């Protein structure tokens, strides 16, 4: 299936919403610029899963499957000294 990640939260907040998600190997992320962008999206040890062009407009959206499970740390890198970073747990 495939379940979406905001990149900034509805209450203005610096923070992927949901900070972290569970989902089931073989499912897709998509990951929708909402607030003060630009943002990416650096999957740790994940070169494949990552997506370091920054996104700069509302609704811009760009997605990774994730087909092994174990827990995945993800983070936006200009917004990283804010603490906008991620968690997805694939089951
Ligand atoms: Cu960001």
Redesign the pocket.
């Known amino acids: 299936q495939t379940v979406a990640i905001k ?2 939260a509805d209450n203005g907040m ?1 923070a992927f919403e949901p900070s972290t998600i569970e989902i089931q190997a073989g499912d897709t992320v998509q990951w929708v610029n909402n607030k ?5 999206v650096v999957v740790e040890g994940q070169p494949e899963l990552s997506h370091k062009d920054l996104a700069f407009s509302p609704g811009e959206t760009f997605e990774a499957t994730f087909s092994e499970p174990g827990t995945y740390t993800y983070y ?4 990283r000294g804010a603490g ?1 970073v991620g968690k997805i747990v694939v089951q």
């Open positions: 990149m900034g610096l003060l962008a630009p943002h990416n936006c890198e200009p917004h906008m």
